[PDB]
Amino acid sequence: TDQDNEIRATDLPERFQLRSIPVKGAEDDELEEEADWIYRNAFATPTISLQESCDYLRKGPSTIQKIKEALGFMRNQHFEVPFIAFYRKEYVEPELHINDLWRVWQWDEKWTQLRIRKENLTRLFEKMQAYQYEQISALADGIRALDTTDMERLKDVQSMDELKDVYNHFLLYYGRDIPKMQNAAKLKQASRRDMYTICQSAGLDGLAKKFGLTPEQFGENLRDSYQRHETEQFPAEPLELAKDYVCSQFPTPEAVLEGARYMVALQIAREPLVRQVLRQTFQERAKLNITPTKKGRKDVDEAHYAYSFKYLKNKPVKELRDDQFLKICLAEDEGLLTTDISIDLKGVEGYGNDQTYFEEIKQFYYRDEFSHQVQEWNRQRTMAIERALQQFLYVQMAKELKNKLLAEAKEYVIKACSRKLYNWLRVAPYRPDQGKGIRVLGIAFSSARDHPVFCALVNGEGEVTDFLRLPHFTKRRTAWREEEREKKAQDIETLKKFLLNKKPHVVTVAGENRDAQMLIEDVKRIVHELDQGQQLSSIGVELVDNELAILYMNSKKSEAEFRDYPPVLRQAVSLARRIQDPLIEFAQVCSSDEDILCLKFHPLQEHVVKEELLNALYCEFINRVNEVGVDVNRAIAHPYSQALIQYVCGLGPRKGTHLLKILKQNNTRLESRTQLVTMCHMGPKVFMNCAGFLKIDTASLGDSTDSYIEVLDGSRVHPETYEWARKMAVDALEYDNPAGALEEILENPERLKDLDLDAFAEELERQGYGDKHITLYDIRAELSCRYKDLRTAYRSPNTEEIFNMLTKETPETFYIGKLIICNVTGIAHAIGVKTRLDNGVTGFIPTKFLSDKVVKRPEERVKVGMTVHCRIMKIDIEKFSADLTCRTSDLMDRNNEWKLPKDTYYDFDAEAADH
């Protein structure tokens, strides 16, 4: 499309061009308001619900200045978050880390969005004011003129909610005139009338205003909690006074008062100050109540996810934790539960009712006089506020608060997903217990014990060099059939010879199921035979999670790439590639079809906004890819690594593909970073954003290329700082040739430890480059060890990781006390009954837990191969075994000794009463 060409030609980061609202330069006034506004909403305002501090990497008021700087770099200099986080960290650290910078970037969108609506909405107010001014200058009790405070209310708005309040307010008082205003300006009229327009047609304005406090005055009495404005008192009874407004729509005084009270109730319910003051009070006092429907009482059993909260009474919203509210909305959409959010405590007690919020605020509008004249008005006033609170405000505030509590729970799930992805991408290449990379033999197999085990040998460069099929490696050495043993001996010898012929450094085995443990023991023994014979050095044997490898094998890419290889053997290669470099491997399952979402990050990841989750996951790729750096020559030479170019800061998928395409057309390796400018004609802003993150391995170059090779290209030193990097290297040697000086330091990096960078930072500041302490420390550390991999060194999975990896269970899905279905495998001598779960855990039922009555012979109750319901009592993660019981007293848990912990606010009375 033309847009792809425009993105390629435009000298701006691709993600800046793909942003919903285009990034526009900002004046210092806008940046200062934005910096304070973002700080208030994103960092200073605590979550309504209890949310875990997700900064796996309360920030003070000093953060406001740091945000102003960060916004300056993004909006005026067009630098992406990674560039700022790595090469402008002196200006944003320690208050803002890379995740905080993304948070600021995402909130900049919201600020720009709020300002855009707030500006056009102001234009509407200016047009409306001009139209009313024309009508008045060219008056009935119902003509309210739009004044300077009406404009100021809008200009002071701090959130989309307050903006919506001002908009709802504008529609209530002026919505009826909008079509008249537009036709007068030169369009056909939106026509429906809320009951408020009927009351206006009846002229009730003269009566509604006589209740006393104006909507705004009541708003201040609410805000200040006292009668700051005294209620004007009319000298007549309301029921007698209503006779003056009797018409065809309101034929009786009793009907006139209901109509007029409705008009007053709506004015109060839509006045911005009243909504603002109530919303604040509502978020602080709101209580959540939950009751199960006819369906919920039958379907929400002990195993259902809604078990801990199907009955809630008076739970403060401030006590909901993590994703719990999302689970509540899901159970409600499933029609299992009914949720109710009230500012009042629910109960039938007299004091309970006397203590309600309505009993508190009615006092701010009642006039304290005992005359019948005033008392009957107070009765009307009571019903005027009551209708405003019960019919308009409590329903709307409950919906708005419901959306915020739900949004916080959805955001938690997104943060939990990114936190899991981060923990996967942070793993470094396996290093044997190195310069030519590691030859890896990946071994994949299907869960069916009759399928052949497949091995794939991948060299350190990522090329598949060979493959092997083993029809009997799945058999067990202690089989009752001698034939199995004999046939397996040929495959054992085949693998031993394959290792002998190819000499791989590490063998990875698929975390498919518990049989992977047998495979590792056999592979370790084969390797141990080579070790005892001293025929080959010890070869690592690693259990590697195969979830990513399954997604690979099922991808369109894994078939097209290796058309002749079976699909099971295709998971053997991804397991070999995954241990070589997890980041390059995870980038393979990030296709245009969004295959990434098939990875099980969180049990609720399918219930969050898809676009928000995708952005939150790509941020984890962008964070790690830029920290690690992408070798362009590796990408051109090996199509496998081309997936990382799209995550390089500034490039993206359109420019990333284009970069490889031009180098492909020229058929030349990328020899130096300057070539991005001279051959790809890359503009200064895109070059600035990506140049520090693109690696060029100077050791791979030679011959005529020697004519121009900047050794610094082989490090994260940014080209803008090459002049300083050379000067810093020349001074460490105290030379009175920049390349010769640098080479001596790169080979002998210890000399840089004596160089005092603090003295040099003062000189750069004096020359006008500003504070450079952290940039110089990065350059010095980088020259001390070029491209030092900041990823966490690879480690073998622990007992907890192995158990979860092979059973595909988590502590939340497989907990002590849980009910389960299991198959009987045998009887232990009787000490108990041996069983096997679907997830492969081997369960054991002690004879004392077989039945409520003492059973001496288990054969009297259970048979081998029989399926039996049981309850987990103890879990042994190390042995893959669980102590199960099947006594009816335990199965039904008559003592409630095993059932999951109920919420603190669980309504035990409602649960007992519904029976």
Binding site: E734, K753, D756
Partner: peptide
Amino acid sequence: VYRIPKKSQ
């Protein structure tokens, strides 16, 4: 001309 001091220990 300017030179960074190696005064660091």
